[PDB]
Design a protein around this nucleic acid. Structure first.
Ligand SMILES: [Mg+2]
Ligand SMILES: [Mg+2]
Ligand SMILES: [Mg+2]
Ligand SMILES: [Mg+2]
Ligand SMILES: [Mg+2]
Ligand SMILES: [Mg+2]
Ligand SMILES: [Mg+2]
Ligand SMILES: [Mg+2]
Ligand SMILES: [Mg+2]
Ligand SMILES: [Mg+2]
Ligand SMILES: [Mg+2]
Ligand SMILES: [Mg+2]
Ligand SMILES: [Mg+2]
Ligand SMILES: [Mg+2]
Ligand SMILES: [Mg+2]
Ligand SMILES: [Mg+2]
Ligand SMILES: [Mg+2]
Ligand SMILES: [Mg+2]
Ligand SMILES: [Mg+2]
Ligand SMILES: [Mg+2]
Ligand SMILES: [Zn+2]
Lengths: 173, 224, 157, 129, 88
RNA sequence: UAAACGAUGUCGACUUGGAGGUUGUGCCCUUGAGGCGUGGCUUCCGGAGCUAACGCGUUAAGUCGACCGCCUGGGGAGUAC
RNA sequence: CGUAAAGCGCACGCAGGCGGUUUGUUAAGUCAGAUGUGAAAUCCCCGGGCUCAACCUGGGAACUGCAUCUGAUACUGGCAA
């Protein structure tokens, strides 16, 4: 029974799309202290650094056999290694959260990283935001020092996907 | 092994188009997404023939050297080779393991001397620090030569993972007439290999598939 | 049991800070006198050690030649670097007709009756290599019949 | 320009063997067909065929034995510049008879052995060993 | 080079039919017409050697075609050389 | 007349690849961008092969074919007549 | 014949050299056979005589050629398509 290699492999292509940026769920086979072996099943057990799998507390919230959704980078960098990274998954989830929060008009905490001529740059879950300088506060707050490094809640006004910037301000209240 | 069995493990993937050896054209089904797809229709029958020849070799008291030094598959190769009363190399292949077998014999003699000494005694005739130093030397030698420490003579066949990764061993084998069965990915050169098994050589699951088939056939030949 | 013949000994030199360091090279050929011949080349500070290294190397790296009653199967040309050698089968009684470098190789190989001549550079080290290659590519009627998918007389007769 | 199509055929054979090609294809001709026929009958090639009517393509399926080309050396002798003719008693033999010399006689193309046994001489097309 | 209309006229004049643009007669006729036209250009620009090379090329090609035509069919050759006033 | 140099005569045929450039052209994605081919010229790596090596390597210095131009120790000398 | 001596500075082009594929015909080249001739001696083979050899000598082979005649027609050439 010569069930065609073409048909059999075509079904796998139905189940596998070798394209960078595509999100595929993979199973961790082994967990090392510095690397995590995720066998998503493309060319090798991808050794994603364990630092990515640490939360804000530095703990591994994953176990042996856990499935995690990872974004595709490539197939082999000269040594046959499939490159995968949990950080890009973080990025995807953060973008989805921001996109839904704009529809929800919800407020998210963020830390003002710096200031520019047109306003300020904030950090929201690792994503850069612009806060209009004229819209930082209702009162003419001369004290620009206190508004640095503190977690303040902002609402997404204009979410920009082409420049990877999010327009935020102290709305709602 | 089954065509479905290999396809499930993903044997069919290969390296990129830009990194390939033209001599592997017959075994390449084609390309998709700028990545080569190996022909498993070539893989399965050749693997069975390799199993048959390895069965004959193992049935005539043949010595089989499992060789693969990829960091991904070294542990699997060690365990699989030990499971079948055979020999392995799981760390960096030393250039001249076969052609400089005389010097490797000197190293094996050193290993036997060290462990015989460390169990008979004379460490009580040595400063505790000298004892620890000689123990460290023994440990390093054991790591280096543990898989071949009891091989005794020239091996009767080589099984190789990633022919390109282990080309040095393939070169010594070619010079010494030792038959080489090798997992040869699309990017590697199959000329030096007597029995080329065309398939993925990275994925630990596929490596384990090949090795499990090899070990089963070897045990069949051994039991008699 | 194998017979070994030293073809040439030469002194080389390497220059270092203190001056010239003298060494020696040895070219030897071993043979079974029945169609198996190997050649070796060794280096050492002294001549006996160089010759012994050459002998050890010569015992390996040896090949088989399908002789025919002490003579070649058919005329053969060999080529290595600038040494072009020509050999042809000869009738009984001719003996070994060849230059010294080819003479030693053929004698230790067992070719009893051969006509040979070296063209171009007579450098012994390359003449030996070209002779060995020529004798190696020389095929036999049984092997050519096997290749062509016929019998011996089907080529001979 | 192209001036020896038999040389082109021989060179195609030689280069395809060197490149380990399974088969070779060339513009056909009756002389090429007869030379391929004698080569096949002497067992230096597997088989041959001709395809087409207006621009016939002749195809030779080569043969390998031990990862080696069965045809070791194929060389034109009577090149267009210098034609080489021999009499029945002057017909050369290649590799002391191990090879074959292709002869064009008054009775068609045949090997040196056949020409000698039939008492004829002719043009030495090429040597094959 | 030559305009489409003059070439069409020459083709009709010297060809068996309009589709025939490869007959030796029409080829020679086109070559002759272009040679005659270029004569003025080289009459004024005597130092235009690069173009003079192409003029020599077309002259030589016409010579070769005329030799072939003469050896293959004398009657058409005589007719053509009379009609074009050539060989003299 | 020149280191008029690629120090590589002209033309034809066969022989694994890769990364570029430049200039046409076909098909297809929803086309712009973008993906599949198919020609010309051209640069750099590199296998077989070849070479004394250096290297050349489908634009060969590989494998052959046609015709032509030269070469035969250095100096005297591209000099004397 | 890239660097050791050796590719004209480059292109066109007459004489000359070579020439895609099919059919017919020709017998020029080519091949086969035969005839004549290729002086004798010399070289070579089998023998013979000087006590051996040199030397002399019998028969033969050879003298690869040239010319003529009758044949073969694959290849090259001529002619025709
Ligand atoms: Mg050596
Ligand atoms: Mg010389
Ligand atoms: Mg024009
Ligand atoms: Mg001058
Ligand atoms: Mg000059
Ligand atoms: Mg210049
Ligand atoms: Mg320049
Ligand atoms: Mg010059
Ligand atoms: Mg020219
Ligand atoms: Mg290169
Ligand atoms: Mg002068
Ligand atoms: Mg020079
Ligand atoms: Mg030039
Ligand atoms: Mg002609
Ligand atoms: Mg013809
Ligand atoms: Mg005649
Ligand atoms: Mg006479
Ligand atoms: Mg007598
Ligand atoms: Mg006599
Ligand atoms: Mg004819
Ligand atoms: Zn690999």
């Amino acid at each position: 029974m010569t069930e065609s290699f073409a048909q059999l492999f075509e079904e796998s292509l139905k189940e596998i799309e070798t394209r960078p940026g595509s999100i595929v769920r993979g199973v961790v086979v082994a967990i090392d202290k510095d690397v995590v072996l995720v066998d998503a099943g493309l060319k090798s057990e991808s050794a994603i650094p364990a630092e990515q799998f640490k939360n804000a507390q530095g703990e591994l919230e994953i176990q042996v056999g856990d499935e995690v959704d990872v974004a595709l980078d490539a197939v082999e960098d000269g040594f046959g290694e499939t490159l995968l990274s949990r950080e890009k998954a973080k990025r995807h989830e953060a973008w989805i959260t921001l996109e839904k929060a704009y529809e929800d008009a919800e407020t998210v905490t963020g830390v003002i990283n710096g200031k520019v001529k047109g306003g300020f740059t904030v950090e929201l879950n690792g994503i850069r935001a612009f806060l209009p300088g004229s819209l930082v506060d209702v009162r003419p707050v001369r004290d620009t020092l206190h508004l640095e490094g503190k977690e303040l809640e902002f609402k997404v006004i204009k979410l920009d996907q082409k420049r990877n910037n999010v327009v935020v301000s102290r709305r709602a209240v | 092994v089954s065509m479905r069995d290999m396809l499930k493990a993903g044997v069919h993937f290969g390296h990129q188009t830009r990194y390939w050896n033209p001599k592997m054209k017959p075994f390449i089904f084609g390309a998709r997404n700028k990545v080569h797809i190996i022909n498993l229709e070539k893989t399965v029958p050749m693997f069975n023939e390799a199993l048959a020849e390895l069965n004959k070799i193992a049935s005539r008291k043949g010595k089989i050297l499992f060789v693969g030094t990829k960091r991904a598959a070294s542990e699997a190769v060690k365990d699989a080779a030990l499971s079948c009363d055979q020999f392995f190399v799981n760390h960096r292949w030393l250039g001249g393991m076969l052609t400089n077998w005389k010097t490797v014999r000197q190293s094996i003699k050193r290993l036997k001397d060290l462990e015989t000494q460390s169990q008979d005694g004379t460490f009580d005739k040595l400063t505790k620090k000298e004892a620890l130093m000689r123990t460290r030397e023994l440990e390093k030698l054991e790591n280096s030569l543990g898989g071949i420490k009891d091989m005794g003579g020239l091996p009767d066949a080589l099984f190789v993972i990633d022919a390109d990764h282990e080309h040095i061993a393939i070169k010594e084998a070619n010079n010494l007439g030792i038959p080489v069965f090798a997992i040869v990915d699309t990017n590697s050169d199959p000329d030096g290999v007597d029995f080329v098994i065309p398939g993925n050589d990275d994925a630990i699951r596929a490596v384990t598939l090949y090795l499990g088939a090899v070990a089963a056939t070897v045990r069949e030949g051994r039991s008699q | 049991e194998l017979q070994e013949k030293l073809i040439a000994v030469n002194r080389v030199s390497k220059t270092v800070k203190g001056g010239r360091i003298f060494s020696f090279t040895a070219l030897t050929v071993v043979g079974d006198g029945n169609g198996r011949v190997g050649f070796g080349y060794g280096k050492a500070r002294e001549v006996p050690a160089a010759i012994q290294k050459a002998m050890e190397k010569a015992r390996r790296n040896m090949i088989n030649v399908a002789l025919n009653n002490g003579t070649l199967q058919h005329p053969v040309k060999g080529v290595h670097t600038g040494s072009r050698v020509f050999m042809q089968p000869a009738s009984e009684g001719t003996g070994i007709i060849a230059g010294g470098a080819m003479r030693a190789v053929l004698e230790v190989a067992g070719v009893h009756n051969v006509l040979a001549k070296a063209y171009g550079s007579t450098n012994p080290i390359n003449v030996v290599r070209a002779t060995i290659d020529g004798l190696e590519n020389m095929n036999s009627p049984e092997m050519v019949a096997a290749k062509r998918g016929k019998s011996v007389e089907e080529i001979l007769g | 320009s192209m001036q020896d199509p038999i040389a082109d055929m021989l060179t195609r054979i030689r280069n395809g063997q060197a490149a380990n090609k399974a088969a070779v294809t060339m513009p056909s001709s009756k002389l090429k067909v007869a030379i391929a026929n004698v080569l096949k009958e002497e067992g230096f090639i597997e088989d041959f065929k001709v395809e087409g009517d207006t621009k016939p393509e002749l195809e030779l399926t080569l043969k390998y034995f031990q990862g080696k080309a069965v045809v070791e050396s194929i060389q034109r002798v009577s090149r267009p510049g210098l034609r080489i003719y021999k009499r029945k008693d002057e017909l050369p033999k290649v590799m002391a008879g191990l090879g074959i010399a292709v002869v064009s006689t008054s009775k068609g193309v045949m090997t040196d052995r056949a020409a000698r046994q039939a008492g004829l001489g002719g043009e030495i097309i090429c040597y094959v060993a | 080079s030559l305009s489409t209309e003059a070439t069409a006229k020459i083709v009709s004049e010297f060809g068996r039919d309009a589709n025939d643009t490869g007959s030796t007669e029409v080829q020679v006729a086109l070559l002759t017409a272009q040679i005659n036209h270029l004569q003025g250009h080289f009459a004024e620009h005597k130092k235009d050697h690069h173009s003079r090379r192409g003029l020599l090329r077309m002259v030589s090609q016409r010579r070769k075609l005329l030799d072939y035509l003469k050896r293959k069919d004398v009657a058409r050759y005589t007719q053509l050389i009379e009609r074009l006033g050539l060989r003299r």
